[PDB]
Amino acid sequence: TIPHLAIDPFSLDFFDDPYPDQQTLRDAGPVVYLDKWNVYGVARYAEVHAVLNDPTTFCSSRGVGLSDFKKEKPWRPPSLILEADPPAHTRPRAVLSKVLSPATMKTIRDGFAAAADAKVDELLQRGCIDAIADLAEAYPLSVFPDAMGLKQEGREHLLPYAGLVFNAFGPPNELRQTAIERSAPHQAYVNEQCQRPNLAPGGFGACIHAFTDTGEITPDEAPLLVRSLLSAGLDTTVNGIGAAVYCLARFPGELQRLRSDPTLARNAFEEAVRFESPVQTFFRTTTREVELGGAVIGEGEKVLMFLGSANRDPRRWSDPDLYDITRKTSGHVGFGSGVHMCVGQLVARLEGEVMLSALARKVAAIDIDGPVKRRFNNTLRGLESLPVKLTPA
Ligand code: HEM
Ligand SMILES: O=C(O)c1ccc(-n2cncn2)cc1
Ligand SMILES: [Cl-]
């Protein structure tokens, strides 16, 4: 009843160009079985959205990677928010929601915007730059560690640690095994910065620790919740901003529309998140036998969701393979959906918006002018190098 496919969604060939195989996964059926890894797969929007929104049946506390925490030891202590289900999830979630709240965005917007404008001005002086190292990486590195309250020393550990986190959601392939092999120094740095004395006043980290006297979290929970922001909040924005620049570089007509109305900046970024989906996949584990899209899945089974595929499913989107900065993007699953829907989405959108605003106001053309190189990760989609010439407006 359920079709069995040999596609390996964690192979380099798949990362290099996932879209044909994603159509094969959607068109094979609402639910497939991936023989390579002994997991169920769902690649259509409807079932991805259904799974995300039934956290009781499709739980997160047995891990959102391939590994089942009921069978194997997690490679690091479980996340108190990502790898927890209601009700344990609920209070740590509320703390992070308040730390990264609508009201908090007002305190950081001016500095984030000024840093975005300054970076674009700097890049225009060079003309030919690498939109990954010099922009997608450099801009978040210039604002987010400081917003966290991190010291300057050791920040070179942050992107490697995040890449490790996202590789570790994958199967035990070479990408994952190599990441874990190299991890000890990055884990040591990150765990230490999570302790209250090492987080500067007024930053996100200190604000998490300040919530430990409300009864929502205890003091021994705060370091792991700081760990969550350092895990989830940098590399993702790098790939999101990188995707947006890549889209504007490939679709000059949309850059021209964005220049003509810079208030489209926020939706241009949201559309980039739909179109490239920086977080491509992740897993749930069934807690009972369940019927999903006409198929029966047993208890204790890993289910792999394809967020990027759901965001390109023609059953849900008109012209899904077009980058359209005026698209009604509401409902895309690039930030997830439901109780775990990205708690840092307002920080992500703020960064993306202010960067695309700076480009909209200051740049007349973005032309790829060198070899484009992809960056391979078991969970994240993004580029390693994006050589572009920026022409000033
Ligand atoms: C473009 C940037 C980003 C993308 C594409 C993205 C994507 C996602 C997705 C898909 C999830 C859901 C995972 C799941 O349901 O298992 C998630 C959760 C999460 N994200 Fe993001 N994210 C981004 C930025 C950020 C930022 C900036 C932060 C923090 C500053 C952050 C922190 C988190 C946390 C803590 C969770 C877990 C929330 C929970 O489990 O309730 N993310 N993110
Ligand atoms: O709590 C953490 O450590 C954490 C939270 C979320 C994620 N993400 C997974 N997919 C997208 N974000 C990774 C780590
Ligand atoms: Cl760690």
Coordinates of all heavy atoms in Angstrom, one line a residue, residues 276-336:
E276 N 13.6 28.8 -0.8 CA 14.8 28.0 -0.6 C 14.7 27.1 0.7 O 15.5 26.2 0.8 CB 16.0 28.9 -0.5 CG 16.4 29.5 -1.8 CD 16.8 28.5 -2.9 OE1 17.2 27.3 -2.5 OE2 16.6 28.8 -4.0
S277 N 13.8 27.4 1.6 CA 13.6 26.7 2.9 C 15.0 26.3 3.5 O 15.4 25.2 3.4 CB 12.7 25.5 2.6 OG 11.4 25.9 2.2
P278 N 15.6 27.2 4.3 CA 16.9 26.9 4.9 C 16.9 25.7 5.7 O 17.9 25.0 5.8 CB 17.1 28.2 5.8 CG 16.3 29.3 5.1 CD 15.1 28.6 4.5
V279 N 15.8 25.4 6.5 CA 15.7 24.2 7.2 C 14.8 23.3 6.3 O 13.6 23.5 6.1 CB 15.0 24.4 8.6 CG1 14.9 23.0 9.3 CG2 15.9 25.3 9.4
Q280 N 15.4 22.2 5.8 CA 14.8 21.4 4.7 C 13.9 20.3 5.3 O 12.8 20.0 4.6 CB 15.8 20.8 3.8 CG 16.5 21.7 2.9 CD 15.6 21.9 1.7 OE1 15.5 21.0 0.9 NE2 15.1 23.1 1.5
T281 N 14.2 19.7 6.4 CA 13.6 18.5 6.9 C 13.7 18.5 8.4 O 14.6 19.1 9.0 CB 14.3 17.3 6.3 OG1 15.7 17.4 6.5 CG2 14.1 17.2 4.8
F282 N 12.9 17.6 9.0 CA 13.2 17.0 10.2 C 12.2 16.0 10.6 O 11.2 15.8 9.8 CB 13.5 18.1 11.3 CG 12.4 19.2 11.4 CD1 11.1 18.9 11.8 CD2 12.7 20.5 10.9 CE1 10.2 19.8 11.9 CE2 11.7 21.4 11.0 CZ 10.4 21.1 11.5
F283 N 12.3 15.4 11.7 CA 11.6 14.2 12.0 C 10.6 14.4 13.2 O 10.7 15.3 14.0 CB 12.5 13.0 12.4 CG 13.5 12.6 11.3 CD1 14.7 13.2 11.1 CD2 13.2 11.4 10.7 CE1 15.6 12.7 10.2 CE2 14.2 10.9 9.8 CZ 15.3 11.5 9.5
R284 N 9.6 13.5 13.3 CA 8.8 13.2 14.4 C 8.8 11.7 14.7 O 9.3 10.9 13.9 CB 7.4 13.7 14.3 CG 7.3 15.2 14.0 CD 7.7 16.0 15.2 NE 7.3 17.4 15.2 CZ 8.1 18.5 15.0 NH1 9.4 18.3 14.8 NH2 7.6 19.7 15.1
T285 N 8.4 11.3 15.9 CA 8.2 9.9 16.2 C 6.8 9.6 16.6 O 6.2 10.3 17.4 CB 9.2 9.4 17.3 OG1 10.5 10.0 17.1 CG2 9.3 7.9 17.3
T286 N 6.2 8.6 16.0 CA 4.8 8.3 16.3 C 4.7 7.7 17.7 O 5.5 6.9 18.1 CB 4.2 7.3 15.3 OG1 4.9 6.1 15.3 CG2 4.2 7.9 13.9
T287 N 3.6 8.1 18.4 CA 3.4 7.6 19.8 C 2.3 6.5 19.8 O 2.0 5.9 20.9 CB 3.0 8.7 20.7 OG1 1.8 9.3 20.3 CG2 4.2 9.7 20.9
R288 N 1.6 6.3 18.7 CA 0.6 5.3 18.6 C 0.5 4.9 17.1 O 1.1 5.6 16.2 CB -0.8 5.7 19.1 CG -1.3 6.9 18.2 CD -2.8 7.1 18.5 NE -3.3 8.4 17.9 CZ -3.9 8.5 16.7 NH1 -4.0 7.5 15.9 NH2 -4.3 9.7 16.3
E289 N -0.2 3.8 16.8 CA -0.6 3.6 15.4 C -1.5 4.7 15.0 O -2.3 5.2 15.7 CB -1.3 2.2 15.3 CG -1.6 1.8 13.9 CD -2.4 0.5 13.9 OE1 -3.6 0.6 14.4 OE2 -1.9 -0.5 13.5
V290 N -1.3 5.1 13.7 CA -1.9 6.3 13.2 C -2.2 6.1 11.7 O -1.4 5.6 11.0 CB -1.1 7.6 13.4 CG1 0.2 7.5 12.8 CG2 -1.9 8.8 12.9
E291 N -3.3 6.7 11.3 CA -3.7 6.8 9.9 C -3.3 8.2 9.4 O -3.8 9.2 9.9 CB -5.2 6.5 9.7 CG -5.6 5.1 10.0 CD -7.1 4.9 9.8 OE1 -7.8 6.0 9.7 OE2 -7.6 3.8 9.9
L292 N -2.5 8.2 8.3 CA -2.1 9.5 7.8 C -2.1 9.4 6.3 O -1.4 8.5 5.7 CB -0.6 9.9 8.2 CG -0.1 11.1 7.6 CD1 -0.8 12.4 8.0 CD2 1.4 11.3 8.0
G293 N -2.9 10.3 5.6 CA -3.1 10.2 4.2 C -3.4 8.8 3.7 O -2.8 8.3 2.8
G294 N -4.3 8.1 4.4 CA -4.8 6.8 4.0 C -3.8 5.6 4.3 O -4.2 4.5 4.1
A295 N -2.6 5.9 4.8 CA -1.7 4.9 5.2 C -1.7 4.7 6.7 O -2.0 5.6 7.5 CB -0.3 5.2 4.7
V296 N -1.4 3.5 7.2 CA -1.3 3.2 8.6 C 0.2 3.1 9.0 O 1.0 2.4 8.4 CB -2.0 1.9 8.9 CG1 -2.0 1.6 10.4 CG2 -3.4 1.9 8.4
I297 N 0.6 3.9 10.0 CA 1.9 3.9 10.5 C 1.9 3.4 11.9 O 1.1 3.9 12.7 CB 2.5 5.4 10.4 CG1 2.4 6.0 9.0 CG2 3.9 5.4 10.9 CD1 2.9 7.4 9.0
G298 N 2.8 2.5 12.2 CA 2.8 1.9 13.5 C 3.4 2.8 14.6 O 3.9 3.9 14.3
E299 N 3.2 2.4 15.9 CA 3.8 3.2 17.0 C 5.3 3.1 16.9 O 5.9 2.1 16.5 CB 3.3 2.5 18.3 CG 3.8 3.3 19.6 CD 5.2 3.0 20.1 OE1 5.8 1.9 19.7 OE2 5.7 3.8 20.9
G300 N 5.9 4.2 17.4 CA 7.4 4.2 17.6 C 8.2 4.3 16.3 O 9.3 3.8 16.2
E301 N 7.6 4.9 15.2 CA 8.2 5.0 13.9 C 8.6 6.4 13.7 O 8.0 7.4 14.1 CB 7.2 4.6 12.8 CG 6.7 3.1 12.9 CD 7.7 2.1 12.4 OE1 8.7 2.5 11.9 OE2 7.4 0.9 12.6
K302 N 9.8 6.6 13.0 CA 10.3 7.9 12.7 C 9.6 8.3 11.3 O 9.5 7.5 10.4 CB 11.8 7.8 12.5 CG 12.6 7.8 13.8 CD 12.6 9.2 14.4 CE 13.2 9.2 15.8 NZ 13.5 10.6 16.3
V303 N 9.2 9.5 11.3 CA 8.6 10.1 10.1 C 9.3 11.4 9.7 O 9.6 12.3 10.6 CB 7.1 10.5 10.4 CG1 6.4 11.0 9.2 CG2 6.3 9.2 11.0
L304 N 9.8 11.4 8.5 CA 10.6 12.5 7.9 C 9.7 13.4 7.1 O 9.1 13.0 6.2 CB 11.7 11.9 7.1 CG 12.6 13.0 6.4 CD1 13.3 13.9 7.5 CD2 13.7 12.3 5.6
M305 N 9.7 14.7 7.5 CA 8.9 15.7 6.8 C 9.8 16.5 5.9 O 11.0 16.7 6.3 CB 8.3 16.7 7.8 CG 7.3 16.1 8.8 SD 6.8 17.2 10.1 CE 8.3 17.2 11.1
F306 N 9.3 16.8 4.7 CA 10.1 17.6 3.8 C 9.4 19.0 3.7 O 8.5 19.3 3.0 CB 10.1 16.9 2.4 CG 10.9 15.7 2.4 CD1 10.3 14.5 2.8 CD2 12.2 15.7 1.9 CE1 11.1 13.3 2.8 CE2 12.9 14.5 1.9 CZ 12.4 13.3 2.4
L307 N 10.0 19.9 4.6 CA 9.5 21.3 4.6 C 9.7 22.0 3.3 O 8.8 22.7 2.8 CB 10.2 22.1 5.7 CG 10.0 21.6 7.1 CD1 10.8 22.5 8.0 CD2 8.6 21.6 7.5
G308 N 10.9 21.9 2.7 CA 11.1 22.5 1.4 C 10.2 22.0 0.3 O 9.7 22.8 -0.5
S309 N 9.9 20.7 0.3 CA 9.0 20.1 -0.6 C 7.6 20.7 -0.4 O 6.9 21.0 -1.4 CB 9.0 18.6 -0.5 OG 8.1 18.0 -1.4
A310 N 7.1 20.7 0.8 CA 5.8 21.2 1.1 C 5.7 22.7 0.6 O 4.6 23.1 0.2 CB 5.5 21.1 2.6
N311 N 6.7 23.4 0.7 CA 6.8 24.8 0.3 C 6.8 24.9 -1.2 O 6.6 26.1 -1.7 CB 7.9 25.6 0.9 CG 7.7 25.9 2.4 OD1 6.5 26.0 2.8 ND2 8.7 26.1 3.2
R312 N 7.0 23.8 -1.9 CA 6.9 23.9 -3.4 C 5.9 23.0 -4.0 O 5.8 22.7 -5.2 CB 8.3 23.5 -4.0 CG 9.2 24.6 -3.9 CD 10.6 24.2 -4.2 NE 11.6 25.3 -4.2 CZ 12.1 25.9 -5.3 NH1 11.7 25.5 -6.5 NH2 13.0 26.8 -5.1
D313 N 4.9 22.5 -3.1 CA 3.9 21.6 -3.6 C 2.9 22.3 -4.4 O 2.2 23.2 -3.9 CB 3.3 20.9 -2.3 CG 2.2 19.9 -2.6 OD1 1.9 19.6 -3.8 OD2 1.7 19.3 -1.7
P314 N 2.7 21.9 -5.7 CA 1.7 22.6 -6.6 C 0.3 22.3 -6.1 O -0.6 23.1 -6.6 CB 2.0 22.0 -8.0 CG 2.7 20.7 -7.7 CD 3.5 20.9 -6.5
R315 N 0.1 21.3 -5.3 CA -1.3 21.1 -4.7 C -1.7 22.3 -3.8 O -2.9 22.4 -3.5 CB -1.3 19.8 -3.9 CG -1.1 18.6 -4.7 CD -0.6 17.4 -3.9 NE -0.3 16.3 -4.7 CZ 0.9 16.1 -5.3 NH1 1.9 17.1 -5.1 NH2 1.2 15.1 -6.1
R316 N -0.7 23.0 -3.3 CA -0.9 24.1 -2.4 C -0.5 25.5 -3.0 O -1.2 26.5 -2.7 CB -0.1 23.9 -1.1 CG 0.0 25.1 -0.2 CD -1.3 25.5 0.4 NE -1.2 26.6 1.3 CZ -1.1 27.9 1.0 NH1 -1.0 28.2 -0.3 NH2 -1.0 28.9 1.9
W317 N 0.5 25.6 -3.8 CA 1.0 26.8 -4.3 C 0.9 27.0 -5.8 O 1.1 26.0 -6.6 CB 2.5 27.0 -4.0 CG 2.8 26.8 -2.6 CD1 3.2 25.6 -2.0 CD2 2.7 27.7 -1.5 NE1 3.4 25.8 -0.6 CE2 3.1 27.1 -0.3 CE3 2.4 29.1 -1.5 CZ2 3.1 27.7 0.9 CZ3 2.4 29.7 -0.2 CH2 2.7 29.0 1.0
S318 N 0.4 28.2 -6.2 CA 0.5 28.5 -7.7 C 1.9 28.8 -8.0 O 2.6 29.6 -7.3 CB -0.4 29.7 -8.0 OG -1.7 29.5 -7.5
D319 N 2.4 28.3 -9.2 CA 3.7 28.5 -9.7 C 4.7 28.4 -8.5 O 5.4 29.4 -8.2 CB 3.8 29.9 -10.3 CG 2.9 30.1 -11.5 OD1 2.8 29.1 -12.3 OD2 2.2 31.1 -11.5
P320 N 4.8 27.3 -7.9 CA 5.6 27.1 -6.6 C 7.1 27.4 -6.9 O 7.8 27.8 -6.0 CB 5.3 25.7 -6.2 CG 4.9 25.0 -7.4 CD 4.2 26.0 -8.2
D321 N 7.5 27.1 -8.1 CA 9.0 27.3 -8.4 C 9.3 28.7 -8.9 O 10.4 28.9 -9.4 CB 9.3 26.2 -9.5 CG 9.2 24.8 -9.0 OD1 9.2 24.6 -7.8 OD2 9.0 23.9 -9.8
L322 N 8.4 29.6 -8.8 CA 8.7 31.0 -9.0 C 9.0 31.8 -7.7 O 8.2 31.6 -6.8 CB 7.6 31.7 -9.8 CG 7.4 31.1 -11.2 CD1 6.4 31.9 -12.0 CD2 8.7 30.8 -12.0
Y323 N 9.9 32.7 -7.7 CA 10.2 33.6 -6.6 C 9.4 34.9 -6.9 O 9.7 35.6 -7.8 CB 11.7 33.9 -6.6 CG 12.1 34.9 -5.5 CD1 12.0 34.5 -4.1 CD2 12.5 36.2 -5.8 CE1 12.4 35.4 -3.1 CE2 12.8 37.1 -4.8 CZ 12.7 36.7 -3.4 OH 13.1 37.6 -2.5
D324 N 8.4 35.1 -6.0 CA 7.4 36.2 -6.2 C 7.3 37.0 -4.9 O 6.7 36.6 -4.0 CB 6.1 35.6 -6.6 CG 5.0 36.7 -6.7 OD1 5.3 37.9 -6.7 OD2 3.8 36.3 -6.8
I325 N 7.9 38.2 -4.9 CA 8.0 38.9 -3.6 C 6.7 39.5 -3.2 O 6.6 40.0 -2.1 CB 9.1 40.1 -3.7 CG1 8.6 41.2 -4.6 CG2 10.4 39.5 -4.0 CD1 9.6 42.4 -4.5
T326 N 5.6 39.5 -4.1 CA 4.3 39.8 -3.6 C 3.4 38.7 -3.4 O 2.2 38.9 -3.1 CB 3.7 40.8 -4.6 OG1 3.7 40.3 -5.9 CG2 4.4 42.2 -4.6
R327 N 3.9 37.4 -3.4 CA 3.1 36.2 -3.1 C 2.5 36.3 -1.7 O 3.1 36.9 -0.8 CB 4.0 35.0 -3.2 CG 3.2 33.7 -2.9 CD 4.2 32.5 -2.8 NE 5.0 32.3 -4.0 CZ 4.6 31.6 -5.1 NH1 3.4 31.0 -5.1 NH2 5.3 31.4 -6.1
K328 N 1.3 35.8 -1.6 CA 0.7 35.6 -0.3 C 1.4 34.4 0.3 O 1.1 33.2 0.0 CB -0.8 35.4 -0.3 CG -1.5 36.6 -0.9 CD -3.0 36.3 -1.1 CE -3.7 37.5 -1.7 NZ -5.1 37.2 -2.1
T329 N 2.4 34.6 1.2 CA 3.2 33.5 1.7 C 2.7 32.9 3.0 O 3.2 31.9 3.5 CB 4.6 34.1 2.1 OG1 4.5 35.2 3.0 CG2 5.3 34.5 0.8
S330 N 1.6 33.5 3.5 CA 1.0 32.9 4.8 C 0.7 31.5 4.6 O 0.0 31.1 3.7 CB -0.2 33.7 5.2 OG -0.7 33.2 6.4
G331 N 1.2 30.6 5.6 CA 1.0 29.2 5.5 C 2.2 28.4 5.1 O 2.2 27.2 5.2
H332 N 3.2 29.1 4.6 CA 4.4 28.3 4.3 C 4.9 27.7 5.6 O 4.7 28.2 6.7 CB 5.5 29.1 3.6 CG 6.3 30.0 4.6 ND1 7.3 29.5 5.3 CD2 6.1 31.3 4.8 CE1 7.8 30.5 6.0 NE2 7.1 31.6 5.8
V333 N 5.7 26.6 5.5 CA 6.2 25.9 6.7 C 7.7 26.0 6.8 O 8.3 25.2 7.5 CB 5.7 24.4 6.6 CG1 4.2 24.2 6.9 CG2 6.1 23.7 5.3
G334 N 8.3 27.1 6.3 CA 9.7 27.3 6.4 C 10.1 27.5 7.8 O 11.3 27.3 8.2
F335 N 9.2 28.1 8.7 CA 9.5 28.2 10.1 C 8.7 27.1 10.9 O 8.6 27.3 12.1 CB 9.0 29.6 10.6 CG 9.8 30.7 10.1 CD1 9.3 31.6 9.2 CD2 11.1 31.0 10.6 CE1 10.0 32.8 8.8 CE2 11.9 32.0 10.2 CZ 11.3 32.9 9.2
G336 N 8.2 26.1 10.2 CA 7.4 25.1 10.9 C 6.0 25.6 11.0 O 5.5 26.5 10.3

